[PDB]
Symmetry: C3
Amino acid sequence: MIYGIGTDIVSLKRIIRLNKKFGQAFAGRILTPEELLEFPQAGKPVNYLAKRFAAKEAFAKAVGTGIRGAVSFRNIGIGHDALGKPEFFYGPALSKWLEEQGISRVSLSMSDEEDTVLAFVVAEK
Amino acid sequence: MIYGIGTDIVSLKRIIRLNKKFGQAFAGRILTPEELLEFPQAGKPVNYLAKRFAAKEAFAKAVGTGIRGAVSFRNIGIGHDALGKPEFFYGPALSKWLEEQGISRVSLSMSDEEDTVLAFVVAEK
Amino acid sequence: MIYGIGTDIVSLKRIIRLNKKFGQAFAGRILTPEELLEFPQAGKPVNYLAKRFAAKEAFAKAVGTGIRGAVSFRNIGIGHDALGKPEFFYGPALSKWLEEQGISRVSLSMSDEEDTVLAFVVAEK
């Protein structure tokens, strides 16, 4: 069954405002250590952060708790499978937290057009 | 299983124009009796209408009929759970229809960024 | 069970520019023979193309491959039922591929608000 569904919209310009405001700190707050390794070489760094920000917020909604406790930005990682499809990877605290509530899997889709970045998330079982 | 899915996006500015054109005749058309009673006390009347308009349209698509018969604006209500998350409530005629179609529950996800309000709906079983 | 999910946002302006750039060849490249046959009767030709473009991209994401091989613009058709519900129709190469992956069904929803066109897709099994 569907445990929950989630969506989030992120403006590129809002990310730009947040970058200026918090400086380095924002990305360091949103991105996981794994994600932070490749961020400096990101061809479109604004899109990179926007994608992660939308996906994690959408994730938090779909799991029904919001960014709280184990469900934290640093625990929710966005990676890609062999064919380039984006997938969630979880920190150990957050990986385990899901089992407890019976959440088996969380699917992700992301898209962008100009200033708008959209994340679509569905949690199963 | 999935009975159907639905989505709709609404511009806050479009809502403002619709209010301009029709007055409350627009709100009277889109809102349920329950919503219409509490609408005057809405802190954000434009955002209030935008959410209702998007969610109801997305609902109608998800059940595969569009606005038709019991699947009407006045039968599709949007309330909020204790945690403040939007959720659907139904006029008795629509509740009966959903049971007939074997739809067990209809999930609702909502997002907003600036001028854009987005609703995604999944009708289950 | 969910095989995968997909979403895509398309600007009408992007379609207009593509149409200017490539002329008729664009529609011929994006649309299936059935879609192309009915294209001249479209009430809003630009929206007609924009919707198909988004839906096909969202489909391709949901099946996890992106536009590649049998998962192609030519093979991914969008039609509407009697009640106006959008549905996918497949060239024989694609329906063959879907059965091989065990993908039983693929649901679709489309919406638009001014310049923004949006598609949501969920592939089951």
